[PDB]
Curated annotation (Swiss-Prot), chains A, B:
Protein function: Activates ribosomal RNA transcription, as well other genes. Plays a direct role in upstream activation of rRNA promoters. Binds to a recombinational enhancer sequence that is required to stimulate hin-mediated DNA inversion. Prevents initiation of DNA replication from oriC. Binds to hundreds of transcriptionally active and inactive AT-rich sites, approximately half its binding sites are in non-coding DNA, which only accounts for about 10% of the genome.
Localization of this protein: Cytoplasm, Nucleoid
UniProt name for this protein: DNA-binding protein Fis
Biological process according to GO: chromosome organization; DNA-templated transcription; positive regulation of DNA recombination; provirus excision; regulation of DNA-templated transcription; response to radiation
UniProt region (Required for the stimulation of HIN-mediated recombination), positions on chain: 1-19
UniProt KW keywords: Activator, Cytoplasm, DNA-binding, Transcription, Transcription regulation
Residue ranges for the DNA-binding region feature of this UniProt entry: 49-68
Recorded superkingdom: Bacteria
Gene Ontology cellular component annotations, sorted alphabetically: cytosol; invertasome; nucleoid; nucleosome; protein-DNA complex
Parent-protein residues present: 26 to 98 of 98
Species whose genome carries this gene: Escherichia coli (strain K12)
GO molecular function: core promoter sequence-specific DNA binding; DNA binding; DNA-binding transcription activator activity; DNA-binding transcription repressor activity; protein homodimerization activity; sequence-specific DNA binding; sequence-specific DNA binding, bending; transcription cis-regulatory region binding
Quaternary data: Homodimer.
Family from the record: Belongs to the transcriptional regulatory Fis family.
Amino acid sequence: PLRDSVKQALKNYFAQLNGQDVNDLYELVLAEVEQPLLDMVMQYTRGNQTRAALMMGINRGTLRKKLKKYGMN
Amino acid sequence: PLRDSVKQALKNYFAQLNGQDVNDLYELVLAEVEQPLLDMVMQYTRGNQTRAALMMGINRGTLRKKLKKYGMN
């Protein structure tokens, strides 16, 4: 499943640190999962935002802030 | 990269729906994703919550509210 892919992505990520700084990991993983989600959900509701917001549990303004930050709408 | 794995996961999941009403998909995906991440940063940081919060760019407070939310500590 998916949580096992996030684990492997983080192992292979931490190895590539070779002892230096990260001060941004949550943002960097959220973008990486948030942006495929938004895109698959928009395709699934045929570009309908309210149906997408309802499917996702967030309201329509949240969908548009999220959308706007991945340069999506 | 990881954005493609999240894509497939959602493909596979939407094929499973039919008359299934989804209303919590942002939180559902997020749960599958912040549990392996938090876990993986605590293993990395040997349970030091200050280094894991800094590493993630999260306040230590927010780190502990997410640990507790998930039943990890």
